Amino acid sequence: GQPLHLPIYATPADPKALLSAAVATSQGGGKLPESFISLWRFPHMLENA
Amino acid sequence: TPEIQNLLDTVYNGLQNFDKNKTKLLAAIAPYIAATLQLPSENVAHSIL
């Protein structure tokens, strides 16, 4: 009962290549607040800022 | 794409306040191109432009 033919040999499966996706988002920029005038002249307000 | 739009926004805010006869346009845009295209040098960003 030993077969004369030799058995066929299986081919192993292909492994999966794990891949990541890196995307970026776009947040909208902020606008300016309102111009509020003050009492001070230029150099004092400049140094303060 | 939002990423290329982020490039547009960064270069837009970056090279805002520019005059042509003050300096070269290419040398002005070269750092943002060197960063967004992840280039190491600035002469390379000059070269590719």
Method: cryo-EM
- Reference B34, options B45, B46, B49, B25; nearest CA is B45
Closest CA to B2 of A21, A28, A46, A8: A28
What is chain A's Cα-based Rg? 37
In chain A, the residue whose alpha carbon lies closest to the alpha carbon of B3 is: A24
Q: Is A27 on the interface with B (CB under 8 A)?
A: no
Cβ contacts of B12 within 8 Å, gap of 6 or more? none
Which amino acid is located at A3 in the chain?
A: P
The CA-based angle A26-A29-A32, given to 5 degrees, is: 175
Q: Which of A23, A25, A26, A27 to mutate against chain B (most B CBs within 10 Å)?
A: A26
* Selection from B4, B2, B14 nearest residue B36 by Cα: B4
Min CA distance, B32 vs chain A (Å)?
A: 17
**DSSP E strand stretches across chain A:** none
C-alpha dihedral (B47, B30, B38, A30), degrees to nearest 10: -160
